[PDB]
Design an enzyme around this catalytic site. Sequence first.
Site, PDB file in Angstrom:
ATOM      1  N   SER B  30      -4.696 -28.196   1.260  1.00  0.00           N
ATOM      2  CA  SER B  30      -4.782 -29.621   0.972  1.00  0.00           C
ATOM      3  C   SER B  30      -3.486 -30.265   1.421  1.00  0.00           C
ATOM      4  CB  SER B  30      -4.969 -29.867  -0.516  1.00  0.00           C
ATOM      5  OG  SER B  30      -4.948 -31.263  -0.788  1.00  0.00           O
ATOM      6  N   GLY B  89      -5.993 -29.131  12.295  1.00  0.00           N
ATOM      7  CA  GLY B  89      -6.501 -29.024  13.648  1.00  0.00           C
ATOM      8  C   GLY B  89      -5.991 -27.860  14.469  1.00  0.00           C
ATOM      9  N   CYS B 130      -2.314 -30.439  14.195  1.00  0.00           N
ATOM     10  CA  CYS B 130      -1.984 -29.077  14.614  1.00  0.00           C
ATOM     11  C   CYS B 130      -2.691 -28.651  15.914  1.00  0.00           C
ATOM     12  CB  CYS B 130      -2.390 -28.313  13.357  1.00  0.00           C
ATOM     13  SG  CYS B 130      -1.244 -29.005  12.148  1.00  0.00           S
TER      14      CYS B 130
HETATM   15  C1  LIG Z   1      -1.703 -28.520  10.443  1.00  0.00           C
HETATM   16  O1  LIG Z   1      -2.922 -29.154  10.177  1.00  0.00           O
HETATM   17  C2  LIG Z   1      -1.876 -27.004  10.166  1.00  0.00           C
HETATM   18  S1  LIG Z   1      -3.160 -26.283  11.203  1.00  0.00           S
HETATM   19  C3  LIG Z   1      -3.219 -24.549  10.724  1.00  0.00           C
HETATM   20  C4  LIG Z   1      -4.334 -23.833  11.483  1.00  0.00           C
HETATM   21  C5  LIG Z   1      -5.271 -23.023  10.764  1.00  0.00           C
HETATM   22  F1  LIG Z   1      -5.180 -22.886   9.430  1.00  0.00           F
HETATM   23  C6  LIG Z   1      -6.332 -22.340  11.395  1.00  0.00           C
HETATM   24  C7  LIG Z   1      -6.491 -22.436  12.797  1.00  0.00           C
HETATM   25  C8  LIG Z   1      -5.593 -23.218  13.555  1.00  0.00           C
HETATM   26  C9  LIG Z   1      -4.528 -23.906  12.920  1.00  0.00           C
HETATM   27 CL1  LIG Z   1      -3.492 -24.834  13.986  1.00  0.00          CL
HETATM   28  C10 LIG Z   1      -0.636 -29.200   9.516  1.00  0.00           C
HETATM   29  C11 LIG Z   1      -0.435 -30.721   9.844  1.00  0.00           C
HETATM   30  C12 LIG Z   1      -1.138 -31.693   8.915  1.00  0.00           C
HETATM   31  O2  LIG Z   1      -0.967 -32.893   9.067  1.00  0.00           O
HETATM   32  O3  LIG Z   1      -1.849 -31.300   8.057  1.00  0.00           O
HETATM   33  N1  LIG Z   1       0.673 -28.598   9.600  1.00  0.00           N
HETATM   34  C13 LIG Z   1       1.358 -28.395   8.463  1.00  0.00           C
HETATM   35  O4  LIG Z   1       0.959 -28.695   7.346  1.00  0.00           O
HETATM   36  C14 LIG Z   1       2.713 -27.750   8.686  1.00  0.00           C
HETATM   37  N2  LIG Z   1       3.339 -27.642   7.349  1.00  0.00           N
HETATM   38  C15 LIG Z   1       3.902 -28.742   6.705  1.00  0.00           C
HETATM   39  O5  LIG Z   1       3.936 -29.880   7.169  1.00  0.00           O
HETATM   40  C16 LIG Z   1       4.491 -28.419   5.309  1.00  0.00           C
HETATM   41  C17 LIG Z   1       5.954 -28.042   5.403  1.00  0.00           C
HETATM   42  C18 LIG Z   1       7.002 -29.010   5.558  1.00  0.00           C
HETATM   43  C19 LIG Z   1       8.375 -28.633   5.648  1.00  0.00           C
HETATM   44  C20 LIG Z   1       9.454 -29.628   5.803  1.00  0.00           C
HETATM   45  C21 LIG Z   1       9.395 -30.714   6.612  1.00  0.00           C
HETATM   46  C22 LIG Z   1      10.531 -31.672   6.714  1.00  0.00           C
HETATM   47  O6  LIG Z   1      10.408 -32.606   7.446  1.00  0.00           O
HETATM   48  O7  LIG Z   1      11.649 -31.469   5.997  1.00  0.00           O
HETATM   49  C23 LIG Z   1      12.748 -32.392   6.098  1.00  0.00           C
HETATM   50  C24 LIG Z   1       8.715 -27.260   5.574  1.00  0.00           C
HETATM   51  C25 LIG Z   1       7.702 -26.283   5.420  1.00  0.00           C
HETATM   52  C26 LIG Z   1       6.326 -26.656   5.332  1.00  0.00           C
HETATM   53  O8  LIG Z   1       5.436 -25.572   5.175  1.00  0.00           O
HETATM   54  C27 LIG Z   1       5.016 -24.816   6.297  1.00  0.00           C
HETATM   55  C28 LIG Z   1       4.038 -23.728   5.817  1.00  0.00           C
HETATM   56  C29 LIG Z   1       2.536 -26.361   9.353  1.00  0.00           C
HETATM   57  C30 LIG Z   1       3.901 -25.723   9.615  1.00  0.00           C
HETATM   58  C31 LIG Z   1       1.655 -25.393   8.548  1.00  0.00           C
END
Ligand SMILES: *[C@@](=O)([C]S[C]C1=C(F)[C]=[C][C]=C1Cl)[C]([C]C([O])=O)[N]C(=O)[C]([N]C(=O)[C]C1=[C]C(/[C]=[C]/C(=O)O[C])=[C][C]=C1O[C][C])[C]([C])[C]
Lengths: 140, 140, 91, 91
Positions: B30, B89, B130
């Site tokens: 989520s 994505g 993504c």
């Molecule tokens: C993407 O939708 C993830 S797609 C994952 C995926 C599958 F599950 C299956 C098949 C293909 C793919 Cl590509 C999202 C983008 C979105 O808008 O939902 N990406 C993320 O959620 C990223 N993680 C985060 O944004 C959470 C996060 C933030 C930070 C700090 C950011 C900052 O700016 O600090 C100052 C650190 C760590 C995380 O957690 C990472 C797990 C991806 C990296 C998962």
Amino acid sequence: DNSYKMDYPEMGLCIIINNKNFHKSTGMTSRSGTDVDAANLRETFRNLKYEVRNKNDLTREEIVELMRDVSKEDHSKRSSFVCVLLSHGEEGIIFGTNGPVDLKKITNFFRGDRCRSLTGKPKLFIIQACRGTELDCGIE
Amino acid sequence: DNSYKMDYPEMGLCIIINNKNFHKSTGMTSRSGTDVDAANLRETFRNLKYEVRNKNDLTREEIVELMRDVSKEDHSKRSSFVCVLLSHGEEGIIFGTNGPVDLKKITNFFRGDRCRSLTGKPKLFIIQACRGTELDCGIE
Amino acid sequence: KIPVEADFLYAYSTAPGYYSWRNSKDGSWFIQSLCAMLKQYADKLEFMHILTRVNRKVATEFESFSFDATFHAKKQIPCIVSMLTKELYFY
Amino acid sequence: KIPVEADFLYAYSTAPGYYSWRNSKDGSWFIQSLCAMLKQYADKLEFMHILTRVNRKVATEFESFSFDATFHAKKQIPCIVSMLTKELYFY
Ligand SMILES: *[C@@](=O)([C]S[C]C1=C(F)[C]=[C][C]=C1Cl)[C]([C]C([O])=O)[N]C(=O)[C]([N]C(=O)[C]C1=[C]C(/[C]=[C]/C(=O)O[C])=[C][C]=C1O[C][C])[C]([C])[C]
Ligand SMILES: *[C@@](=O)([C]S[C]C1=C(F)[C]=[C][C]=C1Cl)[C]([C]C([O])=O)[N]C(=O)[C]([N]C(=O)[C]C1=[C]C(/[C]=[C]/C(=O)O[C])=[C][C]=C1O[C][C])[C]([C])[C]
């Protein structure tokens, strides 16, 4: 500031990879016109101040080397970069005069952490090719 | 002339597809923050004069329909178009709150010969997602 | 008579093949830093010109932080694909 | 510290998935119509602004001709992908 820095002693270097005749094996038709381009091109970037080096009909294992030959090089005093590729192609793939070759590996050497003198400078890639087999019938 | 024609009575229509909670099945986490966006967004295009309609957490078979619902519509007096999609994505694929869905089929209705009132007008698609699983370690 | 696939403009939140980032308190890097530019230059610049400063404000002033080895210290760079056959100036 | 995949600019001769055209006497549509613009606006415009007029001069004034049913009356539309984080002005 807002716009790139282009006042370095050497505007850049404009390698054009003019590919035309394809190994019967590849089965790629010989592109007629390619030449008219490479000339109108070499003349173009010559007027903008680039070190244009034209290479013709290079197999896949050949474009890749030139590239590592080109990434590894002091582009320090160079302001930018331009790679013009004219050949056959698919989506993501470009063609050698012997066999199709993955675009990713090409552009990679000049990546920020691989080609460090070019770092921060604009890597301008011009690709002239077939991203598939679809036609635009055109509306209006 | 050189720049588009934007002096139509209605600037356009800015549908934002705010997707956040994903069906446990999809297994998609989520997305926390998505909401902060959709608001800062709805408020943004509201100031530029768009008919912004926000839809939340729509499954794959749902975004596709809305789209045919949106392509088929007199955009005649409309100056342009904007589709903001926020979700999970992959590359070329966007996510539904039930299952992944091909981007091609989405954007297609608004194609020059399918969405004719929008023809000649700019179809501005903003995708927030993504395109794979690669990280930028950053140089310098 | 024109090319159907024309006039289409797609602004991807990252570079192809890569991940897109998100803040849990401000939200996306790409979305916040975008609206903020149309906040200032929605009537000063063109749009590619906006979308480019948006590219910098996301490639320059945004860097991941995390207790994870892998999900920490990561950057992002947007992707501006354009078929537009003219300029754009919202006003 | 910046995103590696940044500053890269790719100008594809057509739209993804599609064919690219070529004249046997002038050559490519995309290449001739490009040089011709840098012929006029290499010091007047930016570059995206050039690349866009190039998009029109290829989407507007170029239409295939052929004795083939399939390879006749076909259009083309370029693709401008940009990661650049700044503007460009050759001079
Ligand atoms: C993407 O939708 C993830 S797609 C994952 C995926 C599958 F599950 C299956 C098949 C293909 C793919 Cl590509 C999202 C983008 C979105 O808008 O939902 N990406 C993320 O959620 C990223 N993680 C985060 O944004 C959470 C996060 C933030 C930070 C700090 C950011 C900052 O700016 O600090 C100052 C650190 C760590 C995380 O957690 C990472 C797990 C991806 C990296 C998962
Ligand atoms: C592409 O490289 C062809 S890639 C074909 C391909 C494979 F063989 C295998 C796997 C994947 C793919 Cl994608 C070339 C572009 C290039 O620069 O070499 N595309 C073409 O050569 C096109 N044909 C032509 O340009 C020749 C042509 C021109 C015209 C008239 C043009 C005009 O402007 O008139 C005013 C009409 C007809 C043709 O012949 C078409 C067979 C493709 C359409 C093949």
